[PDB]
Amino acid sequence: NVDPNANPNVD
Amino acid sequence: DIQMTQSPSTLSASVGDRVTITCRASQSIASWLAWYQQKPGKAPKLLIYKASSLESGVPSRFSGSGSGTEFTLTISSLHPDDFATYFCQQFTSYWTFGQGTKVEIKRTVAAPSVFIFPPSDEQLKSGTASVVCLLNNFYPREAKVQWKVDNALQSGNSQESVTEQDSKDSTYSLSSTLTLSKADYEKHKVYACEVTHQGLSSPVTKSFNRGEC
Amino acid sequence: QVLLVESGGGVVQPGTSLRLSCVASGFSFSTYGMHWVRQSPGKGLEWVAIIWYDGGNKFYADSVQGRFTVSRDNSKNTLYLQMNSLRAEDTAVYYCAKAYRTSLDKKYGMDVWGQGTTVTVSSASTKGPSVFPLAPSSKSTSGGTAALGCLVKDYFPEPVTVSWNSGALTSGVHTFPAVLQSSGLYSLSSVVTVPSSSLGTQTYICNVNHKPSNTKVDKKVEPKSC
Q: Which helix (H) or strand (E) holds C207?
């Protein structure tokens, strides 16, 4: 569902 | 699928020089470009993030520019600590790196001292023969090392090893090892390495006769 | 200060499984994505895997897809890389790296890497080195200095430590990087430049230690009469 380059941290 | 290619692969410069390194992306990556520094035996270190933003602690002499497919890393005045390999990295579509650009110390041309060692009596008893040619303390790093057995050019039976550039005098050293079977080695007389280098006005041969050492 | 410590690397045969660990400190591990990156002479820098802060989303490079799995245990502050069906082309230094801090950006790289752990995949078996002298002579001198050394030949795996006169001699020593021969074995040479006048009155012994084979050899290097 996500872009692998998207924010991988808590948000 | 985004290929990063840098240029040049090797850059020779002096302390105080202004140097520039270019990185090219096979497709547009906007500003999603990172510059890394790495010295031998150490992990890569992030210097510039998002094309132009220096990380904390990076001296102001470093800077980066570019957007899209063409990127540049610049060191306004080269510092002794800056000689290393530099990698670019895109982080928009997975993560892929360039092949690196080594920034190397540029000193005056230094011709190598050439030395040759015959095989030991111990090794010859075992059944093989190793002849070693030693090129010591030269610059630049490019050198031609040609083994000749009775003037017959050898091919595919030698190996080379080059040190890192010396931190003090900025020279390289190189060792070439020719190996044959005992029975092949005993068939011939004159073993020699021919060395071609920028500091040698003409190739320099060191040789010896089998059995006369 | 961010600290990442890889571990678990080693020398293994192809077709085996190996699991690397990365222990983090100096930052909130459970709130950051983490990366695995490897580096080899043949392939350069290769991204391997990423795992989200909570261990959910995982993405892998094509070259490791189906063979490697990434995982994490936030209670232990550890990142893991399970490798299966290892091949020789998997040989590399494997680094662990923390994702860049949260901002308004929609794309994210990495900022801090660990020191690295080496994974060597090879079908070669452990073998001690043979140590042969490189005898000084008139063909290894120029202008008052003479070169001598030792040939550390046909051993596996890395590394070997080489000292001279039990470590008492440290100047003029050049220990060359080992070359991987096509046999699967390594070889290296260690040389030292000494005064020509000393060869008659000074003894030179190279000391080689190869821990994987519990091998240690002392080889006296004597001049040749030529």
A: strand C204-210
